[PDB]
Amino acid sequence: MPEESSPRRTPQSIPYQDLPHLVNADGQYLFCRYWAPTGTPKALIFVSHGAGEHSGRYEELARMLMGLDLLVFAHDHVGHGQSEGERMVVSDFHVFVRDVLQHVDSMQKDYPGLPVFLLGHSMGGAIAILTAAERPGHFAGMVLISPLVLANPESATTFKVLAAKVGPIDSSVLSRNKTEVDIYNSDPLICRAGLKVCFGIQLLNAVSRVERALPKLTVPFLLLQGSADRLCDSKGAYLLMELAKSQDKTLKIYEGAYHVLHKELPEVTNSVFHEINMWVSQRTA
Ligand SMILES: Cc1ccc(COC2CN(C(=O)[C@H]3C[C@]4(COC(=O)N4)C3)C2)cc1Cl
């Protein structure tokens, strides 16, 4: 008599049979999270986390969102969090987009006729842009927290020279809020290893694809950028503002703020939480 294989486990040895999951096109398991409101959801919203991080970091945002009677759902991108795959490795950047579309396609079927929003930060924001541009007309609304549209020139050129000759980021540039930098540095699911070269060329590659997709955007969106962001240049968010065709487009600059605006100084963070709340609320009522 043949036997079933020993259960599939996350890279932290938890059986997938125990967690919300989905199998992707390459047969890799993805860890999933769901925040479901009491009663009928007004809409669906997918949260796309950034490079090195994981969906767990979006707990508070997602609870506010679910607060407005939306169904929030997320998964960890491949090579992130509790999803399978070599840490911060992807065959091609398009995998992230495809994997989102799959999760949305699934969720839409289970919840027919509901509008769907995207929320992304950083690389997760670049993924949201590409996701939207691949399906013009399909998403109700897009919320972008300092999305990767243009990469910091100082840093990009440094990396390009280093790559041309083939270290971990100073995590202080994340946030003026030093408690949040510390929380980041002590989260076991994060990948704080230096940026591999193959993944770094991929991100500069995504910058290029994002610029090509900009003119094709028609989806409504809210765009939150810090003026002193040393990872995703603020110039990128002006470009998005200029090139997108969306009839419904809005930009908040946070003067002096760094990169992770939902994890910044409370004045900033509270504003970020409020604007997202106001915007999504107006477009679901
Ligand atoms: C050389 C170079 C420099 C800068 C970028 C772009 O900056 C990246 C930072 N990236 C994220 O996605 C992470 C930031 C983080 C961590 O945890 C959070 O909450 N925020 C998510 C995008 C690309 C390249 Cl090639």
Coordinates of N, CA and C and ligand atoms in Angstrom, one line a residue, residues 50-51 53 57-58 121-124 148 151-152 155-156 159 174 184 190 195 200 203-204 231-232 259-260 262-263, ligand 1:
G50 N 6.0 44.4 0.9 CA 7.2 44.7 0.1 C 8.3 43.7 0.3
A51 N 9.4 44.0 -0.4 CA 10.6 43.2 -0.4 C 11.1 42.9 1.1
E53 N 9.8 41.9 3.6 CA 8.8 41.8 4.6 C 7.8 40.7 4.4
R57 N 2.9 42.4 8.8 CA 3.2 43.7 9.0 C 2.1 44.7 8.7
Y58 N 1.0 44.2 8.2 CA -0.1 45.0 7.7 C -1.4 44.8 8.6
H121 N 2.7 48.6 -0.6 CA 3.8 49.5 -0.2 C 5.0 49.1 -0.9
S122 N 5.9 50.1 -1.3 CA 7.2 49.8 -1.8 C 7.1 48.8 -3.0
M123 N 7.9 47.7 -3.0 CA 7.8 46.7 -4.0 C 6.4 46.2 -4.2
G124 N 5.7 46.0 -3.1 CA 4.3 45.6 -3.1 C 3.4 46.6 -3.9
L148 N 7.3 51.7 -5.3 CA 8.6 51.7 -6.0 C 8.4 52.0 -7.5
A151 N 13.8 54.3 -8.2 CA 14.7 53.9 -7.1 C 15.6 55.0 -6.8
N152 N 16.0 55.2 -5.5 CA 17.0 56.2 -5.1 C 18.2 56.2 -6.0
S155 N 21.6 55.1 -4.3 CA 21.6 53.7 -4.0 C 21.6 52.9 -5.2
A156 N 20.9 53.2 -6.3 CA 20.7 52.4 -7.5 C 22.1 52.3 -8.2
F159 N 24.6 50.2 -6.4 CA 24.2 48.8 -6.6 C 24.7 48.3 -8.1
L174 N 14.4 53.4 7.0 CA 13.0 52.9 7.0 C 12.1 54.0 7.6
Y184 N 11.3 46.1 13.2 CA 11.7 45.5 11.9 C 12.9 44.6 12.1
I190 N 11.1 38.6 8.7 CA 11.8 39.5 7.8 C 13.0 38.8 7.3
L195 N 21.0 42.4 0.0 CA 20.3 42.2 -1.2 C 21.1 41.4 -2.2
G200 N 18.2 42.2 -7.1 CA 18.4 43.6 -7.2 C 18.3 44.1 -8.7
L203 N 14.6 44.2 -9.4 CA 13.9 45.3 -8.9 C 14.1 46.5 -9.8
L204 N 15.3 46.8 -10.2 CA 15.6 47.8 -11.2 C 14.8 47.6 -12.5
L231 N 14.6 55.3 -0.1 CA 14.5 54.0 -0.8 C 13.7 54.2 -2.1
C232 N 12.4 54.6 -2.0 CA 11.6 55.0 -3.2 C 11.6 56.5 -3.3
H259 N 10.5 56.2 4.7 CA 9.9 55.3 3.7 C 8.6 54.7 4.2
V260 N 8.6 54.1 5.3 CA 7.5 53.2 5.7 C 6.4 54.1 6.4
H262 N 3.2 54.0 7.0 CA 2.3 53.5 7.9 C 3.0 53.1 9.2
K263 N 4.3 53.2 9.2 CA 5.0 52.9 10.5 C 6.0 54.0 10.9
Ligands
LIG1 C1 19.2 49.5 -4.9 C2 17.8 49.7 -4.6 C3 17.4 50.5 -3.5 C4 16.0 50.7 -3.3 C5 15.1 50.0 -4.0 C6 13.7 50.2 -3.7 O1 13.5 50.2 -2.3 C7 13.1 48.9 -1.8 C8 12.8 48.9 -0.3 N1 11.8 47.9 -0.8 C9 10.8 47.2 -0.2 O2 9.9 46.7 -0.7 C10 11.0 47.2 1.3 C11 11.3 48.4 2.2 C12 10.4 47.7 3.3 C13 11.0 46.9 4.4 O3 9.9 46.7 5.3 C14 9.0 47.7 5.1 O4 7.9 47.8 5.7 N2 9.5 48.5 4.1 C15 9.7 46.9 2.1 C16 11.7 48.5 -2.1 C17 15.5 49.1 -5.0 C18 16.8 49.0 -5.3 CL1 17.4 47.9 -6.5

